[PDB]
């Protein structure tokens, strides 16, 4: 639980850096995914580079019991509840011929319990293929070909990839007959006719304010068996930008939303959305003080290998989210219409893991 909070906290901080760059664009990010991959990379690092990652994340992986709790978290987050709703993968690609440190491979498998993938980067097209094939075979072909793999060179020695796909089954599905086309107000004032689903139900609903003093509402949408849930947060007034909500995001605030919630009868009109986002993690991580990782000589990967000057040639995250009627009367006094840009959060409630989060500017 404590590691799950630390991991999500770091991941929401990386998302904010991704969201502030896009601003007017659709973004889908995995806070757990970026934490899981950088927790693995902590083992490859030493010196100045390791302390940069450890300080920004808020935890050391070699500390006890950080890794056993991290494993127990994946086992927990994974199976048997997820009916091929969620498909995740983490991969560290290293040079095949590169002489690894004596006792790194047994120490990495002892803690995860997986291995660092070995590929020959001199065979450029085959190297790009194996990276894309690993993503395709582990995410059930739901994620489209990587665009970042174009940075794969002969001089490339270390590649980081994290891919996630999610299309969850709702606890209470939205009726198909209730799905109608309605106007969506874009940030630039313009309106678009988008398909919007609707359902009258008892929703976990709360109201919070921004520092500047503005109201924003948070609605909780549960997935089957109450394991996973989706939070939809957006400011009440359309004149208020979604950035005002994004700038104040943290893992503690998301927990406060859940704690302050009350079950209320409402008619919910929410749009259908399908987003795919490939993120180059270089700039969001460099902005968070993790600059050494991508520097030619400054990068300290001495814990993995000391045979050649090592550094991250590519660090990516490709996430795909699908929100429809179902993964595969009722009385209400007021209706909630999500006809303006909104923020979404996919949370694993027993541990408080922020698996997914993003901004839907235009469905």
């Amino acid at each position, epitope marked *: 639980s404590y590691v799950a909070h630390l991991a999500s906290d770091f991941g929401v901080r990386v998302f904010q850096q991704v969201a502030q760059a896009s601003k007017d664009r659709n973004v889908v990010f995995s806070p757990y995914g970026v934490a899981s991959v950088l927790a693995m990379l902590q083992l490859t690092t030493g010196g100045e580079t390791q302390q940069q990652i450890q300080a920004a994340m808020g935890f050391k992986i070699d500390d006890k019991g950080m890794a056993p709790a991290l494993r127990h978290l994946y086992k927990e987050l994974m199976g048997p509840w997820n009916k091929d709703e969620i498909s995740t993968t983490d991969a560290i690609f290293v040079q095949r011929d590169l002489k690894l440190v004596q006792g790194f491979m047994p120490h990495f498998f002892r803690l995860f319990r997986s291995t660092v993938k070995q590929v020959d980067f001199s065979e450029v097209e085959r190297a790009r293929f194996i990276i894309n094939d690993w993503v395709k075979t582990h995410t059930k072909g739901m994620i489209s070909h990587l665009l970042g793999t174009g940075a794969v060179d002969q001089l490339t020695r270390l590649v980081l990839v994290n891919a996630l796909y999610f299309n969850g089954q709702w606890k209470t599905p939205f009726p198909d007959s209730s799905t109608h086309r309605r106007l969506f107000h874009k940030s630039d004032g313009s309106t678009v006719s988008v398909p919007m689903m609707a359902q*009258t139900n008892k929703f976990n609903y709360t*109201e919070f304010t921004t520092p500047d003093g503005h109201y924003y509402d948070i609605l909780e949408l549960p997935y089957h068996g109450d394991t996973l849930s989706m939070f939809i947060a957006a400011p009440y007034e359309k004149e208020v930008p979604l950035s005002a909500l994004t700038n104040i995001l943290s893992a503690q605030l998301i927990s406060h939303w859940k704690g302050n919630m009350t079950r209320l*009868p409402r*008619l919910l009109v929410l749009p259908k959305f399908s987003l795919e986002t490939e993120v180059d993690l270089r700039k969001p991580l460099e902005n968070l003080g993790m600059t050494d990782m991508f520097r030619q000589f400054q990068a300290d990967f001495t814990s993995l290998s000391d045979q050649e000057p090592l550094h991250v040639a590519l660090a990516l995250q490709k996430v795909k989210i699908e929100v429809n009627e179902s993964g595969t009367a009722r*009385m*209400a*006094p*007021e209706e909630i219409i999500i006809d303006r840009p909104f923020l979404f959060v996919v949370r694993h409630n027993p541990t408080g893991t922020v698996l997914f989060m993003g901004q839907v500017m235009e469905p």
Partner: antibody
Amino acid sequence: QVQLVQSGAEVKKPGSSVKVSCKASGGTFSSYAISWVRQAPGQGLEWMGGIIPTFGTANYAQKFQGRVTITADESTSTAYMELSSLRSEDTAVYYCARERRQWLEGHFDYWGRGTLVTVSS
Amino acid sequence: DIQMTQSPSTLSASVGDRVTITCRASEGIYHNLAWYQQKPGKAPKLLIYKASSLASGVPSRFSGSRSGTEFTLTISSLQPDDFATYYCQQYSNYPLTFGGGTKVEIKR
């Protein structure tokens, strides 16, 4: 041009069952909610329940549970409200209210003239 | 159950005066508050919905605002037709509850 015509005033002994009607014209009856709000002499307003004619089943206040029965005849375009086990405390003006918004039961724009129900004894 | 408290119970004012009448909820009701006007021997008439939105055909002098869990109905310039009883109603959760009422009288 929405109008809500209610049945005539009634005086009943503290037995007893009183049934008040509410004819609606002109608009879609099936989709919009018709509620019942009462007002005691020299007192405030009190919501009893409401009904969306297409739903069939009415919403009620836990205070009046086991007494009230709210029905709506789609063909007649009239909503009803019967109150059993009447007493001196039920002496009030009964208003018929209609929602401006579809499928919802919150605030009312259209109101009927009122039916006075005197409970005596 | 959300208790609707109205302050004052009785209000005395002159024609052309600014009138402010208060409503209070026992718990948060979002912006889901309606304002009604009632004249003796007449059915209630909706003026304000969603705390500040003005109902169809209702004049400009009528205003609404939200201050946390408190809502105020403002009449900028009081007119002879405005001397009536005013009720606030919440539409957040069931049961739908109304306020105690605030009668607006002629200042003599």
